[PDB]
Curated annotation (Swiss-Prot), chain B:
Heme binds at C63. This protein is similar to the oxygenase domain of eukaryotic nitric oxide synthases but lacks the reductase domain which, in eukaryotes, is responsible for transfer of electrons to the ferric heme during nitric oxide synthesis. It comes from the Bacteria. Keywords: Heme, Iron, Metal-binding, Oxidoreductase. This is Nitric oxide synthase oxygenase. It comes from Staphylococcus aureus.
Amino acid sequence: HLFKEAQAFIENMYKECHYETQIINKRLHDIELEIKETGTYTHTEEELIYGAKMAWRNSNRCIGRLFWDSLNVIDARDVTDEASFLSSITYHITQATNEGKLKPYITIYAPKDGPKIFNNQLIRYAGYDNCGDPAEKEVTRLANHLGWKGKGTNFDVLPLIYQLPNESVKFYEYPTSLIKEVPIEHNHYPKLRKLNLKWYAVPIISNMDLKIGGIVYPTAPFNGWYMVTEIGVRNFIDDYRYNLLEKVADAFEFDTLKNNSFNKDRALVELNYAVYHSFKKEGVSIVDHLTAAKQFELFERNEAQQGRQVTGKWSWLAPPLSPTLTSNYHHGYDNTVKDPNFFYKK
Amino acid sequence: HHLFKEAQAFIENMYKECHYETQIINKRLHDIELEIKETGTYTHTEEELIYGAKMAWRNSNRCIGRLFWDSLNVIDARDVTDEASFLSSITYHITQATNEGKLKPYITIYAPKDGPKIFNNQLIRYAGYDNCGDPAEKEVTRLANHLGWKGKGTNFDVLPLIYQLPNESVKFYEYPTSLIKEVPIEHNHYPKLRKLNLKWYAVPIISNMDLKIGGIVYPTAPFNGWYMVTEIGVRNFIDDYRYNLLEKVADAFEFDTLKNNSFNKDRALVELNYAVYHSFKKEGVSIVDHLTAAKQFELFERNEAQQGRQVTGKWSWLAPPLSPTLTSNYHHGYDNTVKDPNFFYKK
Ligand code: HEM
Ligand code: HEM
Ligand SMILES: OC[C@H]1O[C@@](CO)(O[C@H]2O[C@H](CO)[C@@H](O)[C@H](O)[C@H]2O)[C@@H](O)[C@@H]1O
Ligand SMILES: OC[C@H]1O[C@@](CO)(O[C@H]2O[C@H](CO)[C@@H](O)[C@H](O)[C@H]2O)[C@@H](O)[C@@H]1O
């Protein structure tokens, strides 16, 4: 079964790379071998780089796949000592941030006996009883249990929580200078700044499994740049998250929030307008929900031109703001999940 | 036989819900089994027809307004076979449904075999032309024109009923003006919007679906409820394959630009729904906003739990096309199993 998934991957990659049937066979030969010698096989560095790009390209729930081939992949399968591991994490965050103009990065670690990461994202705000991000409560209790103690504000950057093989779980705090943050303000509603809201620049998912032709990489944090509604609608407004609708509505001076007023709806638009332009002011990359969809159309065009069909999960590709104003809203998608890809941990 | 299976499942589900003794159910199943052998199908007890229609609305996975299923006003018109009575029954439904603005949910079920045939998508819809009107009603408008119907050629020409009684040509019938309640759209804060001369009808009456109850298919059974703001303010007015009014409306709201990062497109959308909502309110026509409708759906789920029934649904349709994250249904999935009785699109 392993060789079967492996074969599938090699064929697709090489066919897409216009490789002579000849070498394809040689490669399958080499693989079939070490699968017997070992139990699994090892991807060439070209396959690892191409496999991760393909995984992003098959990520059905991703609206930003237009830039899939832009991924900067880092082979860290050899990282086994604490110093180099930590060094690789900070390097990723530093190179991804790129002084504001974010760059797609993925740091792939060893598929077996490798560094384990417990964070949902390399960068997240703690979640406490009376403040913080409710979604990060679990990971925050773990941090505290380990000995970590944050300032206790609404935006305490959680530390990297990791564990090397044959060692206990540890946590590492990033120097604040490493994490770029964006104060949120509205150039038409002075009172918004008074709420002291802000968000980090780079979203680095570190709790998913990367699968390339049979091999499963349990640790391979990756990042892109935000799309307004992620911060302005879900992070800040979801009732199970920061749930700031009321405080923000006040900053916008809406005397009421009765459903009849449609102020709840106006507050959402304004908040995303503030988030977007606050990021723009800090020189940090961000894309608005509608532009993000236009870029997605191009992705679809670029794929059809390469003879590939487009898969996707409708409910995710559609933004939580003026969804009908996006092309993808008006038709369905084939949610078929292909390999390579990213999956949730069991 | 296949028919009896479905009739039985319906009878059992229904009578069980009404707490009817086992003997009552078995007696009914006998009578049904009997008349299927003697005639091909069976006839629904008037009670079964009324409760069956309500179970159909309650099982409709795509409907956010199911909290009111219990209140459906069912009209049995399986006896109507002549034209004059057919039309009369239509104006009656429209009359009762509208109720001068205090809209009431109604459904008229005609004969399941050899009954009146209806071609409209909704009893009330605006004509669709090549240079104006509702693009969605092009096909139906072509038919109306072919039959000799001729409208003033505006963006809002109320189409005529198009029907056909057995062994008779397809005809069209124009509703009296007084019969069709309409609402002019205007925004209190934006006087320029009135200048667009927009409006919409009060009652949404679906007339293009099949009602299925215990194996019995009722092809002609128009139903209605009242509108939820986004159906008009977002889809009907803004979809590019509908009236496509974003640019025009934006100008009425005086937006200097519609470039994406300006977010005016989104403000324009919220403002247009605010207009549509209060316009209906000003004219005294029932309407519910998207968020309020979703709150009522929460109640529906609470009531259904208390009745031992599970709730099915189609997520993408339940989530409104405006600030969907502000509705509870957006944050979890829904079992889209289609149970009977139910409504179906005509094949
Ligand atoms: C370049 C900028 C990018 C943009 C703007 C973009 C945008 C998005 C958005 C809006 C989501 C929805 C998140 C949510 O609301 O839950 C998402 C999900 C996703 N994206 Fe992208 N993306 C980008 C880069 C990346 C990269 C680099 C990868 C892969 C290496 C990727 C993989 C995915 C995956 C796996 C999901 C689903 C994750 C989940 O299940 O929660 N994205 N992306
Ligand atoms: C009493 C007020 C009601 C409200 C506010 C309500 C609201 C809605 C909404 C918002 C939709 C989606 C429309 C669209 O986007 O195309 C819908 C669909 C639906 N509703 Fe309701 N509804 C009501 C009454 C009814 C009644 C009385 C019935 C059944 C006898 C019903 C049957 C359905 C069905 C079958 C659909 C799907 C129709 C389609 O496929 O286009 N609804 N309703
Ligand atoms: O936009 C992509 C999305 O559209 C659907 C709608 O059914 O299919 C269309 O696009 C495909 C290309 O990805 C074509 O293969 C297909 O023929 C066309 O109808 C979805 O299947 C697809 O996910
Ligand atoms: O809300 C209905 C919807 O919820 C799901 C999961 O999203 O089912 C869970 O919640 C129901 C509460 O209404 C329970 O009856 C059900 O047992 C539970 O699993 C869907 O399956 C359902 O469509």
